Curated annotation (Swiss-Prot), chains A, D:
Prevents the cell division inhibition by proteins MinC and MinD at internal division sites while permitting inhibition at polar sites. This ensures cell division at the proper site by restricting the formation of a division septum at the midpoint of the long axis of the cell. One of its GO terms (biological process) is division septum site selection. Disruption phenotype: In a minCDE operon disruption (minC-minD-minE), cells divide not only at midpoint but also at their poles, yielding small minicells and long rods. Loss of polar localization of several polar-localized proteins including GroEL-GroES, TnaA and YqjD. This is Cell division topological specificity factor. The gene is minE. Belongs to the MinE family. GO terms for cellular component: cytosol; plasma membrane. Keywords: Cell cycle, Cell division. The keyword Cell cycle applies. Transmembrane segments: none annotated. GO terms for molecular function: ATPase activator activity; identical protein binding. The chain holds residues 13 to 82 of 88 of the full protein.
Swiss-Prot record, chains C, E:
Keywords: ATP-binding, Cell cycle, Cell division, Cell inner membrane, Cell membrane, Membrane, Nucleotide-binding, Septation. The gene is minD. This is Septum site-determining protein MinD. GO terms for cellular component: cell pole; cytoplasmic side of plasma membrane; cytosol; plasma membrane. Belongs to the ParA family. MinD subfamily. It holds the Pfam family CbiA. ATP binds at K10, G11, G12, V13, G14, K15, T16, T17. InterPro entries: CobQ/CobB/MinD/ParA_Nub-bd_dom (IPR002586), MinD (IPR010223), MinD_FleN (IPR025501), P-loop_NTPase (IPR027417), ParA/MinD_ATPase (IPR050625). It is a peripheral membrane protein.
Length: 70, 250, 250, 70, 250, 250
């Protein structure tokens, strides 16, 4: 049943596409620049090292990032 | 006049087939319609409308004042009320100016066209941006396939970074209910849960579509073709009539 | 190193499917191969190779010195000897420079890649011109359909306009022998009489191709798929071995 | 009532001290090295730029860090 | 023989007062006890025991063989069964060796001492590490104050990092129930919820403690002092007798 | 720049309280001040200044080049002109090198700090020796108690075995005039007759000090606290202004 695999793969990207318009133009540029850089000192590929932005009821943001190490 | 862009992002999903069948269907319903090819250097609309050999002047010729709208418009011989404005064949990105396209569209409204169907090219670059820019409505053409759904979402992002808004519709094309139930193909509902827009039509996979482009005869003209009937339903929905969705169950 | 562009003009004919299956097949044969997505703002190669989520740096990142070739290359996990360089996702047409692309290609030759497969986008514009510019060979991907054959001819005109010229090959894709004999589809021979170039492969219409992109697994990896077997034949022919054409008769 | 303020301030530290023994001698060295570095490109002080390690029932870890931006 | 270290991390919490009062209380109960000053260059135990002027040889003198345990031990004149081994007064951190301290402790067990009370200095450095190293039990001395609770936690980390582990006890000192209820001071329960160890005693803030060190007379000897009575309760609890906690309510 | 060490020998006399209140008071008077924690493995200054959670880099990090003075300095948020350099948390005696500490102090003079307050740890060992070594002035912090007066005298012996000499001042802390007149506590004069140095301040026993460390707010900021006012007098005397000694009579 490949229709189910297709549906899951799709949501994770269009969630990704829906997300890119909420972020600034630099904040995601920096994360990709430096968090992945801790590769030389850690070394893992994603393979989810999750990234999730949140917000509070007061014009505040919350960029949380999960690091699931195996 | 309702300016309707037929767009997609992904190449080869059925934009041309849909632009042709829909423009024809509207003409059949007595609505004076023109369908315009917005492609840059690739002439595919004239091939599907079957008038590849009557093309004298094109869209860019009219914009640069080398021809009148009357000289470039091709009146369809098979269907009353239908006209075609064909694409330029220069490798040139520019040509189709914002001011130029706007001037052409105003002339067409002045000629009393009720429907101006804009057959957009693939991509998110120049030709595609120009075809949606003046639209009142957009028909996002999609297949139950991963590349097509991803590229349609990118196109919705571009249509929305405009904040009367563009009225958006999903035209799910090349659907196969049998494939959906065997779990091999994204269902109509899976596609709606992802691209969250109003469904305007579902075109079944039909062997009549290859036979139609072979002849240069839009598939709505084949009264026995399931794809033809689903395009006639779409035209009804565009004219404001509710119609149950056929060819979604096997 | 053999730089092979996979091109077409017409959108949705099978360039991505073919670029993926062929790059994989070559890797399987022990030839160190890289497949590069030359698209502008539409990432479809990573989706078909199944590595859409491992994409950190892309082709344009390497050209602008924001990343090394080592940082942007994605080593396939499923097949040994295979690498993917994914496409940029900016609407910027400029991004891909002639000097930039040439520098990347030289670095890849220096890394001992035997085969550099260039997955070209649709059209005759920027991305498509850049993918064929440095090619040693071109795989013209075509369907037995009127729009596709017209657009492939336009592409041959561009490929044809110092050294040994681009070696051209026809990859006839989505073929259906049954449809050909009922007189509904252009035959392999009809297509060769029009685009007069050497046949390198014939990919049958196969229900395995939709299942393959659903999983992000190139169709050559499905050992029961007819499309997979026809792609393995194509790879043999690219390596200089003659092979009889299968799936041309019903 | 300052006894209550004292108690809260204390728990945050002794949680901090209880925590330092749970992880490697480098992982917290790197985070302090580079996450705070995104100061030049972002600029905010903790503001507990929160940090929480987790684990799964399979010898797996989950270093998550919240970034509450004002 | 039970080797009990009196420790804290934070300076000036009551280690010396507690080491003195507890060693005395145990001696009063007929248990032959020695209290040893583990400080490096600061002699504070002899000052609180009131024998600052009878100090001839010290702990380091015994370790370096310049004196016998009999020559350095000071038999208390006021309480039967009590002895004091005073601290060295050199700035030399080395002086106190692991092998040296172990040899002294074995000699003391051989002299039939039931209780060896180790009065540790402040810090986490040399003298403090040496006093807890051979302990069977630790009395963590703490005030209801932020610096003291933080430094006691650091000490617990060191005590925790073969045999039955060091038995740990909390000696909450300089408590003031009135201050706790007006919300100005951490309560006994607040301190236990943070340093999660067994409570062994609560010493109230008492004006008798300043008067006791002024005279060089451990506060347990003042039969009217509340701090004295709370130290006698602590001694009971160390001997295995349960006792209700006094001076915790106002 | 005036480098002022706050020292004592005896633990828990008020060094941290005094270092904090004095550094703040000087900052309030518009003098750019930094207060440095010289402790080895015990962080108590950041706890009293209320910035325990903003500590990223410390004194040892700056010495070993893992951080700049700008990265480790914490600018106080409550008082203008005030900065904190916090202590390392390694059990390591060395770390704080003579050459290292000197380099930091020169950088601070270069940053235009008028006052560099050195919050020394207890003892006579490493951390304490390092804090007084470069001092221009020493504030000997003492209680009207026997252990504290004995240990302050030992510290004066070390400050004096340097023969512009270190300017020495006595900060008599936790004074209680009522206790002095009932004959239970050494008077201010008794302490001066023993440690024969210039009196710079007398801090009364005040219930405001426990409330201040509970909040992480130096006691000089509490405008109703007697201890706060006596610290503001001390700051005046350090700036060269004579002030009558308050809170010495009941
Ligand atoms: N409903 C359908 N059933 C079968 N084939 C279809 C259908 N719609 C389109 N096609 C085929 O798909 C291809 C793409 O159609 P086309 O209209 O040219 O795409 P586009 O305009 O998006 O490039 C053509 O080869 C056409 O025959
Ligand atoms: N041999 C085949 N049999 C059946 N479907 C195919 C075959 N080759 C390609 N397709 C389908 O045709 C569409 C276009 O394929 P794709 O490789 O993405 O086109 P392109 O990369 O040329 O734009 C996809 O929906 C793919 O699933
Ligand atoms: N229960 C108490 N009530 C009042 N003052 C006390 C009490 N316990 C200790 N003190 C005072 O606290 C200070 C520190 O006591 P001390 O035993 O010398 O500390 P340490 O040995 O831990 O360094 C002394 O000035 C002592 O008089
Ligand atoms: N003037 C004062 N009145 C009351 N308590 C005080 C006073 N000064 C200091 N203290 C208390 O004495 C203890 C020691 O203070 P602290 O500054 O931490 O000492 P040190 O730095 O010398 O170790 C703390 O528990 C503090 O609350």
């Amino acid at each position: 049943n490949t229709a189910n695999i297709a549906k899951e793969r799709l949501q994770n990207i269009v969630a990704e596409r829906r997300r890119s318009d909420a972020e600034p133009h630099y904040l995601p540029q920096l994360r990709k620049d430096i968090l992945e850089v801790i590769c030389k000192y850690v070394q893992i590929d994603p393979e989810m090292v999750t990234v999730q932005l949140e917000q509070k009821d007061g014009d505040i943001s919350i960029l949380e990032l999960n690091v699931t190490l195996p | 006049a309702r300016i309707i862009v037929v767009t997609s992002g992904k190449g080869g999903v059925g934009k041309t087939t849909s632009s042709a069948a829909i423009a024809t269907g509207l003409a059949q319903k007595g609505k004076k319609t023109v369908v315009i090819d917005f492609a840059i250097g690739l002439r595919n609309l004239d091939l599907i409308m079957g008038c590849e050999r009557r093309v004298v002047y094109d869209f860019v010729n009219v914009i640069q004042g080398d021809a009148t709208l009357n000289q470039a418009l091709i009146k369809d011989k098979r269907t009353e009320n239908l006209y075609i404005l064909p694409a330029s064949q220069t490798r040139d990105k520019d040509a189709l100016t914002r001011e130029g396209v706007a001037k052409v569209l105003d002339d067409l409204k002045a000629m009393d066209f009720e429907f101006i169907v804009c057959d957009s090219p693939a991509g998110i670059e120049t030709g595609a941006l120009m075809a949606l820019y003046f639209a009142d409505e957009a028909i996002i053409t999609t297949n139950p396939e991963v590349s097509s759904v991803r590229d349609s979402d990118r196109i919705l992002g571009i249509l929305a970074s405009k904040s009367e808004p563009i009225k958006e519709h999903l035209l799910l094309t090349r659907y196969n209910p049998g494939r959906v139930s065997r779990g091999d193909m994204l269902s109509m509902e899976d596609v709606l849960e992802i691209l969250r827009i109003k469904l305007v039509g579902v075109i079944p996979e039909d062997q009549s579509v290859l036979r139609a482009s072979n002849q240069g005869e839009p598939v709505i003209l084949d009264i026995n073709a399931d794809a033809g009937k689903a395009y006639a339903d779409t035209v009804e929905r565009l004219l404001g009539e509710e119609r149950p969705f056929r060819f979604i169950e096997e």
